[PDB]
Design a protein around this nucleic acid. Structure first.
Lengths: 97, 63, 64
RNA sequence: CAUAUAUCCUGAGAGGUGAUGCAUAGCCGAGUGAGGCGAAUUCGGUGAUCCUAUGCUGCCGAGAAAAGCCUCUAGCGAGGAC
RNA sequence: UGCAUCCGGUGAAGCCGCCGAGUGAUCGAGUGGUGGAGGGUGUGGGAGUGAGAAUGCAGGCAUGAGUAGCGAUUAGGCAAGUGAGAACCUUGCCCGCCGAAAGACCAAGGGUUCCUGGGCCAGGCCAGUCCGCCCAGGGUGAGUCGGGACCUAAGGCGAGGCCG
RNA sequence: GUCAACCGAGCGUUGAUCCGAGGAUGUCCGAAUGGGGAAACCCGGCACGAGUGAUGUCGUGUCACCAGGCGCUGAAUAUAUAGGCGUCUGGGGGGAACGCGGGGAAGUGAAACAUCUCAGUACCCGUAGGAAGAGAAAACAAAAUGUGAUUCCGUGAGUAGUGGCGAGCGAAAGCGGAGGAUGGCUAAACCGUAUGCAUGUGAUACCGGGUAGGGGUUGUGUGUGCGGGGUUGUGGGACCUAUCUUUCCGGCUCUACCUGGCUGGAGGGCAGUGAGAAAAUGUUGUGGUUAGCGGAAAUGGCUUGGGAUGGCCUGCCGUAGACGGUGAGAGCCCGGUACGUGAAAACCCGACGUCUGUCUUGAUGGUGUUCCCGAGUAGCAGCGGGCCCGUGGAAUCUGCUGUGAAUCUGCCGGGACCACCCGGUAAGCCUGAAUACUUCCCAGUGACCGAUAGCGGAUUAGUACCGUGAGGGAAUGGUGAAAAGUACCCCG
């Protein structure tokens, strides 16, 4: 048996100078499963935080290629989802600033 | 036109020999004729290739 | 976490309920590392292995 | 039954709206620079290789297909259209 | 390598010397220095067993030589700063060059070169505090843009099939 | 886990980390198989669920092509076929060598070169297997009252031969060995039965005798299927016909009755996963494999030393003085060795039974005739291949095209051929052991290499790099016993 859970899609938040600025305008940005789609996260996030989501914008990031002595290593690619909460706007406290 | 659909005859391979005994490769092709096979005496003919040996032996029925 | 011996007596509903319970903890744990305010690293390992334990128990009952 | 600048279709552009907004010449302190205020905005001349134009007029060398849109019935139908 | 014997952390092999030896390839169980773990001899066995040369192969290094060059047809200068170090970095003021380009935006191509902080043995035909260089972190947001989810041309593949 | 550490965190006698065996999960590409495609990325259908106010969305299944079974359907078209459906089972791709059957060169040697050699080699195609191929005389042989399936080694023999008789090429008989299965099963002639296609003097016919009943074991034919029957070369077998003959019962031999056969059901043997038929099922075996465990004897003294495993001198074990490690040459310090012990489970070998099949409704030995003994086959001819044999006097084997027989006083071989003698019985099929190989796994060995050697690869290795692509393709090991890797001060 396999049990699905919307927390499978959302991996972890992303902490940065740009991301904290977006939170001030009540826009949160997560790192999602690389094979999700804007409709899937919107459903998933509403179910998780029980808040109303307005729109979702996603972008694909190619991992940096870092030179090493043994060889040319390449990090992991990832997908970022920048989700904007609606006017109801319950701040996500679990985000931990 | 070199493989019979019934007996599976094949073209034999050999060397053509000239007067100066120059051996040159060649093939011995079966005599394979186009035949209208009538499997059932009802009379629906199907088109196949049959060696002249199979025709003589009566393996195909042209009805 | 939970030994398989005690997990092999819960009914199907309790295991599934325990399964979604743990995924709550795993998701909470993942956010805490990204924030950086979680110190006990090994808590992740125990939780991930806990989920696998429940799945295996559920999978045995489907055929064994 | 018709030769009407009749009617209809296409259509550059002018005009209104969009615009009590936005933005700008400059004026203030402030200084990495943040911020605030912010005037007049008419007439012409020239002018395209761009638009009307997949048009019009000539010529022989005679100048893609399919989806799309419209229409016709065949066919579905007790609900359906605006 | 068989067999028998002797030397060796009280210092073997190897390398550098001194003093000598043999008719030759060569010798030194004669001895100094360096060295740190295996060697010698007798008698048999077997050889990937002896290089100065093949416009021979690989590595290191010479002579030419501190020589030629340092990659256009534009051109730089001064004051101040940072710095241990400045013609080449930053700021200001002048001069000059392109201006159907040496300006602005793309497709193909590249793939992190983009921004912030840091570095100055490697690279930059010089030095460099600078950098398309090195390290760490960050950055790419689409119902309407270029594509797929719509359509076909040349062409490719091609159920069955024909031919072989 | 590791290069490879540093930080932060934890587990473990309630058994962790580890090693063995069996399970579960196993994203996406790949034969790739729902459709597509620039391999690893785009788009779906159907059913069942999950989720929203509903579209959107998410899971679990399932959906390629072809072949073969099976059931329905049967176009032009009438029988019917093609074809269409639905459903079950299979394939497809990979792999280092070894096998088998096909196709098949050139450089080269001939001191040129075409015949010939290189060579049926390189390469290509189709195919399996743990091995494959071959195999049970239409064989050798030479007058011996000999051998007796195949395969594989040694000899025969670089001989007989063959060859622009040039270069070269090169057997077999026989003899000595390895293995034992000189093994098995069919087709025909006859019977019985079930049919399909015909027909019927539809009657005096179909069963052994006799008694009688009858008008279909159709009266007759035929073909096919299935059970007996037979598998042989001193020819064998079918029919025919004499002698003896090792359980019971039933129904058939058109029918009932006394005589000869056929078949079923119960004792008794005989075999079995095999070539001789096949699928299983238990019980057992200190049988084996896949983890391991035990395992004797010096802290010996003195000296050199940083260190003893060095030197000298004493003990001790030895079914253990193999090999490594430990601060320098260790049987007595460690891992081990000799020698013993160890399996829950899985797999493999056996063995004993359930079970399967067969013989007993059967055998033994005798006599004289008709039928059968593998057909477009054998043989002959034309053109080739290959055998020591290059078309030669050219036998045996074999491919293609024609022609085209006999069934035992028959047919084929005994190097053209003919006659005699001798051997064998073709045109049907299975068969282990002897034999070849090593991608991989386990234990070892070396008068083999020791970093320009040995694999191209002791280290980022088919990596870096070169090329659009096929492809080409490197270089780099050593501090020390331990990192004790130089605290602190000075110039910079």
């Amino acid at each position: 048996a396999t049990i699905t859970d919307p927390r499978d899609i959302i991996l972890a938040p992303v902490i940065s100078e740009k991301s904290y600025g977006l939170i001030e305008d009540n826009v949160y940005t997560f790192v999602v499963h690389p094979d999700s789609n804007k409709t899937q996260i919107k459903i998933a996030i509403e179910k998780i935080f029980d808040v109303k989501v307005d729109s979702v914008n996603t972008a694909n990031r190619q991992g940096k290629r870092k030179r090493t002595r043994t060889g040319f290593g390449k990090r992991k690619s990832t997908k970022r989802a920048i989700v904007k909460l609606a006017a109801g706007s319950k701040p996500i406290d679990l985000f931990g600033a | 036109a070199a493989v019979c659909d019934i007996c599976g005859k094949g073209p034999g391979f050999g060397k053509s020999v000239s007067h100066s005994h120059r051996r040159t490769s060649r093939r011995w092709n079966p005599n394979i004729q186009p035949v209208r096979a009538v499997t059932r005496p009802g009379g629906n003919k199907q088109r196949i290739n049959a060696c002249t040996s199979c025709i003589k032996a009566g393996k195909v029925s042209r009805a | 976490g939970t030994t398989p011996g005690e997990l092999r007596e819960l009914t199907d509903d309790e295991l599934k309920d325990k399964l979604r319970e743990s995924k709550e903890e795993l998701f909470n744990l993942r956010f805490q590392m990204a924030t950086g305010q979680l110190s006990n690293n090994r808590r992740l390992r125990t939780v991930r292995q806990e989920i696998a334990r429940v799945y295996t128990v559920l999978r045995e009952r489907e055929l064994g």
